[PDB]
Design a protein around this motif. Structure first.
Motif, mmCIF file in Angstrom:
data_model
loop_
_atom_site.group_PDB
_atom_site.id
_atom_site.type_symbol
_atom_site.label_atom_id
_atom_site.label_comp_id
_atom_site.label_asym_id
_atom_site.label_seq_id
_atom_site.Cartn_x
_atom_site.Cartn_y
_atom_site.Cartn_z
ATOM 1 N N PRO A 97 0.811 -1.228 0.000
ATOM 2 C CA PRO A 97 0.000 0.000 0.000
ATOM 3 C C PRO A 97 0.836 1.266 0.000
ATOM 4 N N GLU A 98 2.070 1.205 0.506
ATOM 5 C CA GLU A 98 2.965 2.354 0.471
ATOM 6 C C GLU A 98 3.464 2.668 -0.933
ATOM 7 N N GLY A 99 3.211 1.795 -1.903
ATOM 8 C CA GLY A 99 3.619 2.023 -3.271
ATOM 9 C C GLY A 99 4.838 1.257 -3.730
ATOM 10 N N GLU A 100 5.399 0.392 -2.889
ATOM 11 C CA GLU A 100 6.539 -0.414 -3.300
ATOM 12 C C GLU A 100 6.128 -1.395 -4.391
ATOM 13 N N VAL A 101 7.025 -1.605 -5.349
ATOM 14 C CA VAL A 101 6.789 -2.510 -6.469
ATOM 15 C C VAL A 101 7.875 -3.575 -6.421
ATOM 16 N N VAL A 102 7.498 -4.791 -6.045
ATOM 17 C CA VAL A 102 8.413 -5.924 -5.980
ATOM 18 C C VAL A 102 8.114 -6.829 -7.173
ATOM 19 N N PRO A 103 9.037 -6.976 -8.128
ATOM 20 C CA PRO A 103 8.738 -7.811 -9.305
ATOM 21 C C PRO A 103 8.506 -9.273 -8.963
ATOM 22 N N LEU A 104 9.395 -9.875 -8.173
ATOM 23 C CA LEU A 104 9.279 -11.274 -7.760
ATOM 24 C C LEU A 104 9.439 -11.325 -6.243
ATOM 25 N N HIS A 105 8.327 -11.183 -5.527
ATOM 26 C CA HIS A 105 8.348 -11.226 -4.072
ATOM 27 C C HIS A 105 8.270 -12.671 -3.596
ATOM 28 N N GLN A 106 9.188 -13.049 -2.712
ATOM 29 C CA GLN A 106 9.265 -14.402 -2.180
ATOM 30 C C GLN A 106 8.845 -14.386 -0.717
ATOM 31 N N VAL A 107 7.860 -15.212 -0.378
ATOM 32 C CA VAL A 107 7.355 -15.334 0.984
ATOM 33 C C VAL A 107 7.485 -16.788 1.410
ATOM 34 N N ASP A 108 8.113 -17.012 2.561
ATOM 35 C CA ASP A 108 8.273 -18.365 3.074
ATOM 36 C C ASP A 108 6.917 -18.971 3.409
ATOM 37 N N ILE A 109 6.783 -20.270 3.162
ATOM 38 C CA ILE A 109 5.538 -20.993 3.375
ATOM 39 C C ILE A 109 5.796 -22.113 4.374
ATOM 40 N N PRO A 110 5.106 -22.142 5.511
ATOM 41 C CA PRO A 110 5.305 -23.238 6.464
ATOM 42 C C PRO A 110 4.795 -24.559 5.912
ATOM 43 N N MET A 111 5.404 -25.642 6.387
ATOM 44 C CA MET A 111 5.043 -26.988 5.965
ATOM 45 C C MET A 111 3.873 -27.559 6.757
ATOM 46 N N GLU A 112 3.334 -26.803 7.716
ATOM 47 C CA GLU A 112 2.255 -27.275 8.586
ATOM 48 C C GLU A 112 2.660 -28.554 9.315
ATOM 49 N N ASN A 113 3.921 -28.611 9.734
ATOM 50 C CA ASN A 113 4.435 -29.774 10.437
ATOM 51 C C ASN A 113 3.843 -29.855 11.842
ATOM 52 N N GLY A 114 3.878 -31.062 12.408
ATOM 53 C CA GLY A 114 3.388 -31.246 13.764
ATOM 54 C C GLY A 114 4.175 -30.446 14.784
ATOM 55 N N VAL A 115 5.483 -30.311 14.570
ATOM 56 C CA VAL A 115 6.335 -29.512 15.444
ATOM 57 C C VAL A 115 6.765 -28.202 14.807
ATOM 58 N N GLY A 116 6.468 -27.986 13.526
ATOM 59 C CA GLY A 116 6.840 -26.773 12.837
ATOM 60 C C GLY A 116 8.163 -26.834 12.104
ATOM 61 N N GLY A 117 9.011 -27.815 12.411
ATOM 62 C CA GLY A 117 10.283 -27.925 11.736
ATOM 63 C C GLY A 117 10.154 -28.468 10.326
ATOM 64 N N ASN A 118 11.152 -28.149 9.507
ATOM 65 C CA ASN A 118 11.203 -28.608 8.126
ATOM 66 C C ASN A 118 11.872 -29.967 7.979
ATOM 67 N N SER A 119 12.375 -30.542 9.068
ATOM 68 C CA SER A 119 13.014 -31.848 8.998
ATOM 69 C C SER A 119 11.972 -32.929 8.739
#
Ligand SMILES: Nc1ncnc2c1ncn2[C@@H]1O[C@H](COP(=O)(O)OP(=O)(O)OP(=O)(O)O)[C@@H](O)[C@H]1O
Ligand SMILES: Nc1ncnc2c1ncn2[C@@H]1O[C@H](COP(=O)(O)OP(=O)(O)OP(=O)(O)O)[C@@H](O)[C@H]1O
Ligand SMILES: O=S(=O)(Nc1cc(CC2CCCCC2)n[nH]1)c1ccccc1Cn1ccnc1
Ligand SMILES: CC(=O)N[C@@H]1[C@@H](O)[C@H](O)[C@@H](CO)O[C@H]1O
Ligand SMILES: [K+]
Ligand SMILES: [K+]
Ligand SMILES: [K+]
Lengths: 30, 281, 396, 335, 50, 167, 56
Positions: free
Chosen positions: D226-248
């Motif tokens: 909303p501030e007007g920033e233009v990000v061509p390829l914005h990358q947002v981390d996505i959780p794996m919905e793990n039981g403990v939250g870890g990626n292992s």
């Protein structure tokens, strides 16, 4: 061909000088 | 695939429907005889020089007759080319006028009526003024090239072995150059036209531009158009120069190979330096 | 009869080392090959590594370039060196023909020098492409060693008193001069860069127009050979063959060819002319003088290139006449006979009577003539286009 | 021959208002840009690279990155150049000593059995590769030859060490083993426990287990603040919905990777209607882990475009129990 | 000029006469080109009227 | 062992010459740009942010260079990142963040403030962890500035103009 | 010193494992043999490097 082009270029330069020495937009600075 | 199209069918139909048979036959015969005489005069001169380098006699008349025949043949070729072009232009213009007159008003309304006028004026002017000279120059150039290649092959039989890859390279270069140059010329035209349009609209509305204080924007637009036209012309000239240097290098390689073969055969085949000069020149 | 590097004559008398090793003709010839073989052995792994990296390089697609000072001087020096080495090869081939044995020492060092020069110019082009000036140390060492060897050969010839009447002596002197000039160019480049001894090098950034990704006309910013041969247009032609050329394909024009820049230069020239001469009218002669003062630095260059091409044009007929005159003699068994120390040095007139030599000279002259003609055409067209843009802007 | 010039008196005057470009206009549906390919190999082009010789500074790294044929060619060229240089040096030394001259053996030759450049090259080969025939022995009255021999031995040992190190580093590479990982050709989205989630299947072919398995999920899209920033390829981390939250994860059989679409998840405002081809959406999954054999971390990269997402679909079971163990039908990976 | 000078040594006066033939014919070609330009102007104005 | 070293490869990482601070989604954050030159990908990328300053506790402790970890404001909180194109590293300045009481007036040169960013990750070629260290002083912080876009899409792929890294 | 396939095999062993007895020396008039020797040395070095890497 080179001579004819040179003559035509001389005519063009004379015509351009005459055009440039014509009236201009006065009071532009003011 | 659509862009890559030499389209000889259109030229053949044009020739059949406007030139005829007698004019085409006369043109072909005149060109072939003229270039045959061009080969023959060089051959006779080489033979005369070889004979003079000490049956045979002084050929003070045969050479003159050959030169006169060549001059007459060139005159006949030029006259026939111009007459055929004039008659073709006249017949094509008459046929186009007859077809346009006998055309439906529904098609008239459907057509933009501007493309028809452009084809009737500019294309006809180019055909009347540029087609004959262009065809004559192209025919003379290709026939001279064929004659030179034939002379080189006759002087050195082993020349064709190196010529064939060079011929393939020349064909590829010509194809690529034509493909690039058609688009380059089209872009050059479609970029130079807007510059003239902008100049006309600026001249017409100078007072309006002065009142609206858009002189800076108009100057920026004119500069952009000029830069586009200039860069298009620069790319076209760069392509032309690349083609020129490629062909010049091919010709230099041909000269070197022919000279080497002639030198090698001089000490073994004993060419007597007769055909050597003709091949070199 | 095996292959002997030196003269096998007189039960291999050329391998004697008496009366000083430096006085042996074959010994100095063998010494001269050391710089060439060293340069080959150094550059070949480097060239292989560079080619392998380029085989899987993605940054080089839009990588910038930074020409080193004296780029054109380096290229013309390399071309002159190549021509001199070709002449030396021809002279050696002519000289060893009279001898029954091969006498490989006469021409093999020249061929090694030719290959070394080609590898060195390719190496310099690679260093120009990838801004790594530190690698020029090997090239400098090669230049110094070659200059030392050529100087030793020249002083040996002077001791033998070859004199200016000998084409081999003249070519040796020319090679010494060329090696010295190349060494001076390398030293000047090192001094400009200040990268060996000085702690802080004076790096130069690539020009902004070249750094711009919207520019595709790389002719102004290219190696001298690439600019002369229009080699950079090969990729453009290949792209045009498949993809039709549009406005997107044609990149933005560089800074040097800007219509605004040309207009500003024309205005500066007009103001300078008005300041120099207080002439109220703006006549046709005044316009011509302004145009000359604005575009002479390229018009004179184009005219000089055209003049050089025209001068080299007559080389064709000259070589043809010489070849036919040489072949006009019934007896061809005769060979030049001028022996000083068994090398059978060939004079200029005898050397020019070689059909192969004349053909090679004709080929080189035609190449240079047509290249200069094309360059002059390109320069004239560019100057005319810039003048047209400036005139259009002035009219607007 | 010759040609004509561009003499245009009036350009036909009436030659204007032609228009009708008749352009093919086929570039509208040419292709869609992909951040990475289905088999890794990120399709990203670098431009305006201002290098200062650091590319050639890492000579060893470049050699390791070179393919096997290129490495073999470089090895052969380097060894041949070294052999030729040393042979030329020996030949020059023999010529200077004069033993090359076919004279009486009054003086002790600098190097024995030297007769030609071929003999010199054979001696150089024997010296560098430590063959030592002995017919071409080194005399004790040639100190320059002794020094040259020492230098040649040092250079040969250094070259052998460098080549062995490069070979070992190239052999330690396991990118081809990293390519053995298998990912679903098209991903699916379906409800789980009353909650919508983005499922994906990943499997391995080789029986060798990958240790320290770690999978990262990100979304690449153009995001404007909303501030007007233009990000061509914005990358947002996505959780794996793990039981403990870890990626292992413990990957033996092809597992299903699912991410629960919550309010905080950027996928919270996605519809199957906007799941067409030309959509500003791309799912990137990066898997990391070390190989039990080489001990080298390996990376797997895959991309899932919007058209590659199968809305309202469920992966079929792949593991079937047998009499003594379990079986996996890898032909059912993408069903 | 250079070509004529060298060809004078190569062949002699006959080559000079042959070259002077082309030298004199060049202004003839210039006059023919001028007449062609006039004819082209007439054709252009007629075509513009048409 | 010497050949296995990759410190020179670790030096190929590129960081912004001067960092910027600007509002994002109505929240002020400290942005920074980091990029890589070589096409070789670095695996297990991990970036750590800390602030070095002299902090004195109310109990009277005097710490000359106190280091406080700074979160990356990641979507999941982890420091793992996927760096292909030069990415923008931003930290949201919250109440718990030590930067919660900073003003552009106190952003002069001689200021007790220094930002340290440590990037860790293994090379896909050598398999050796590499460390990148950069510093941002108070005078090196560009208050109220925004990094320009660097990635531009092409016909078949995307393009990165590295000359726009510091603009 | 080439008399039989056994002698040839002994020479090959000496060349590849860099033993170099010297009784079976290489003449300077056999360029094909020289090239074969170079190729054999390169192959042996590459094989040794590969085997050492696998062992490590
Ligand atoms: N049985 C298998 N063995 C090896 N690779 C497989 C197998 N099944 C799928 N793949 C891989 O999965 C990827 C997706 O492409 P492909 O359409 O072949 O597979 P899929 O969608 O999993 O198909 P399937 O219906 O066999 O499960 C490819 O890289 C393919 O090699
Ligand atoms: N295009 C580039 N290629 C290589 N390094 C670069 C490039 N742009 C910036 N850098 C590096 O960024 C660091 C900051 O210094 P520098 O002022 O040169 O860059 P910058 O602020 O990113 O500039 P720019 O305006 O080019 O983005 C330096 O280490 C410099 O080498
Ligand atoms: O062979 S040339 O280079 N021809 C050529 C014309 C253009 C026009 C461009 C520039 C203007 C805009 C369109 C593209 N570029 N190049 C050549 C060069 C020098 C002298 C003589 C010639 C041969 N000549 C002359 C007329 N027709 C052929
Ligand atoms: C070039 C020259 O003259 N070489 C001579 C040779 O003629 C002579 O026969 C020999 C004595 O046996 O000495 C040496
Ligand atoms: K040994
Ligand atoms: K031995
Ligand atoms: K041994």
């Amino acid at each position: 061909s080179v001579v004819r082009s040179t003559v035509k270029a001389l005519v063009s330069v004379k015509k351009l000088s005459e055009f440039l020495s014509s009236a201009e937009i006065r009071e532009e600075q003011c | 695939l659509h862009q890559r199209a030499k389209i000889p069918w259109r030229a053949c139909t044009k020739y059949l429907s406007s030139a005829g048979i007698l004019l085409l036959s006369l043109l072909v015969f005149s060109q072939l005889l003229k270039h045959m005489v061009l080969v023959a005069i060089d051959y006779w001169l080489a033979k005369w020089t070889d004979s003079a380098l000490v049956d045979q006699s002084v050929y003070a008349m045969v050479f003159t007759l050959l030169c006169s025949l060549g001059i007459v043949l060139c005159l006949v070729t030029s006259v026939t080319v111009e007459w055929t072009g004039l008659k073709v232009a006249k017949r094509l213009h008459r046929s186009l006028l007859n077809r346009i007159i006998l055309a439906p008003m529904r098609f008239f309304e459907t057509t933009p009526l501007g493309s028809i006028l452009n084809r009737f004026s500019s294309d006809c002017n180019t055909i009347d003024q540029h087609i004959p000279s262009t065809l004559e120059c192209l025919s003379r150039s290709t026939l001279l090239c064929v004659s030179a290649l034939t002379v080189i092959s006759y002087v050195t039989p082993v020349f064709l072995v190196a010529l064939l890859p060079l011929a393939v390279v020349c064909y590829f270069i010509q194809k690529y150059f034509r493909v690039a140059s058609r688009d380059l010329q089209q872009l050059d035209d479609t970029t130079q036209l807007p510059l003239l349009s902008h100049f006309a609209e600026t001249v017409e509305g100078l007072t309006t531009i002065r009142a609206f204080r858009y002189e800076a924007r108009f100057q920026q637009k004119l500069l952009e158009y000029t830069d586009s036209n200039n860069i298009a012309s620069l790319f076209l000239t760069a392509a032309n120069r690349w083609l020129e240097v490629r062909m010049e290098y091919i010709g230099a390689c041909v000269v070197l190979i022919a000279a080497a073969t002639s030198i090698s055969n001089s000490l073994h085949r004993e060419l007597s330096a007769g055909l050597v000069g003709l091949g070199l020149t | 009869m095996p292959l002997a590097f030196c003269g096998t004559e007189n039960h291999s008398a050329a391998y004697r080392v008496d009366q000083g090793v430096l006085n042996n003709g074959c010994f100095v010839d063998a010494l001269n090959v050391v710089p060439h073989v060293f340069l080959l052995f150094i550059t070949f792994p480097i060239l292989f590594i560079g080619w392998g990296s380029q085989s899987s390089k993605v940054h080089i697609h839009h990588s910038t370039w930074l020409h080193f000072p004296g780029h054109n001087l380096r290229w013309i020096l390399t071309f002159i060196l190549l021509f001199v080495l070709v002449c030396e090869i021809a002279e050696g081939i002519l000289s060893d023909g009279v001898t029954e044995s091969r006498h490989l020492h006469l021409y093999m060092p020249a061929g090694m020098a030719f290959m070394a020069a080609i590898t060195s110019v390719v190496y310099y082009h690679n260093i120009e492409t990838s801004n790594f000036p530190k690698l020029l140390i090997a090239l400098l060492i090669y230049w110094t060693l070659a200059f030392i060897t050529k100087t030793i050969k020249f002083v040996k010839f002077y001791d033998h008193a070859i004199g200016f009447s000998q084409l081999r002596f003249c070519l040796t002197g020319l090679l010494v001069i060329l090696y010295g000039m190349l060494l001076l160019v390398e030293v000047n480049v090192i001094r400009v860069r200040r990268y060996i001894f000085f702690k802080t090098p004076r790096e130069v950034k690539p020009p902004e127009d070249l750094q711009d990704l919207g520019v595709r006309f790389l002719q102004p910013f290219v190696n001298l050979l690439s600019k002369g041969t229009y080699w950079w247009m090969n990729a453009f032609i290949k792209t045009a063959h498949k993809k039709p050329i549009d406005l997107r394909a044609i990149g933005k024009l560089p800074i040097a060819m800007r219509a605004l820049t040309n207009y500003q230069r024309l205005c500066v020239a007009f103001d300078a002319q008005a300041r120099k001469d207080t002439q109220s009218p703006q006549g046709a002669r005044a316009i011509w003088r302004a145009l000359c003062h604005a575009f002479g630095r390229r018009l004179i260059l184009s005219s000089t290139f055209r003049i050089l091409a025209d001068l080299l044009g007559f080389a064709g007929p000259l070589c043809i006449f010489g070849i036919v005159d040489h072949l006009g003699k019934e007896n061809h068994v005769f060979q030049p006979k001028t022996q000083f120390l068994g090398v059978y040095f060939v004079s200029s007139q005898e050397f020019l009577g070689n059909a192969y030599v004349l053909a090679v000279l004709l080929f080189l002259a035609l190449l240079l003539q047509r290249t200069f003609l094309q360059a002059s055409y390109y320069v004239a067209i560019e100057t005319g286009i810039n003048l047209r843009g400036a005139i259009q802007t002035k009219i607007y | 021959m010759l040609s004509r010039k561009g003499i245009i008196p009036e350009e036909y005057v009436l030659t204007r208002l032609a228009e009708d470009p008749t352009e093919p206009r086929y570039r509208t549906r040419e292709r869609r840009a992909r951040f990475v390919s289905k088999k890794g190999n990120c399709n990203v082009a670098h431009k305006n690279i201002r290098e200062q010789g650091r590319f050639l500074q890492d000579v060893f790294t470049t050699l390791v990155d070179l393919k096997w044929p290129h490495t073999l060619l470089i090895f052969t060229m380097s060894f041949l150049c070294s052999w030729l240089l040393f042979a030329m040096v020996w030949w020059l030394i023999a010529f200077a000593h004069g033993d090359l001259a076919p004279g009486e053996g009054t003086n002790v030759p600098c190097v024995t059995s030297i007769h030609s450049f071929s003999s010199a090259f054979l001696f150089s080969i024997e010296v560098q590769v430590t063959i030592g025939f002995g017919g071409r022995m080194v005399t004790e009255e040639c100190p320059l030859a002794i020094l040259i021999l020492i230098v040649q031995n040092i250079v040969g040992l250094m070259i052998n060490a460098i080549m062995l190190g490069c070979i070992f580093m190239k052999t330690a590479q396991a990118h081809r083993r990293a390519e053995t990982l298998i990912f679903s050709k098209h991903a699916v989205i379906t409800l789980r426990h009353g909650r919508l989630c983005f499922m994906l299947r990943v499997g391995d072919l080789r029986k060798s287990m990958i240790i320290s398995a770690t999978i990262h999920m990100q979304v690449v899209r153009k995001t404007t603040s909303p501030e007007g920033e233009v990000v061509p390829l914005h990358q947002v981390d996505i959780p794996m919905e793990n039981g403990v939250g870890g990626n292992s994860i413990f990957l033996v059989a092809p597992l299903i990777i699912y991410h629960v679409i919550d309010s905080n998840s950027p996928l919270y405002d996605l519809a199957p209607s906007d799941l067409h081809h030309h959509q500003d959406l791309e799912i990137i999954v990066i898997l990391e882990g070390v190989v039990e054999t080489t001990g080298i971390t390996t990376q797997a990269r895959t991309s899932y475009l919007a058209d590659e997402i199968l809305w309202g679909q469920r992966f079929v079971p792949i593991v079937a129990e047998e009499d003594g163990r379990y079986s996996v039908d890898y032909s059912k990976f993408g069903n | 000029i250079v070509g004529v000078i060298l060809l004078y040594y190569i062949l002699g006066v006959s080559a000079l006469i042959g070259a002077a033939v082309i030298i004199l014919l060049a202004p003839v070609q210039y006059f023919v080109a001028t007449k062609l330009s006039q004819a082209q102007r007439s054709t252009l104005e007629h075509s513009n009227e048409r």
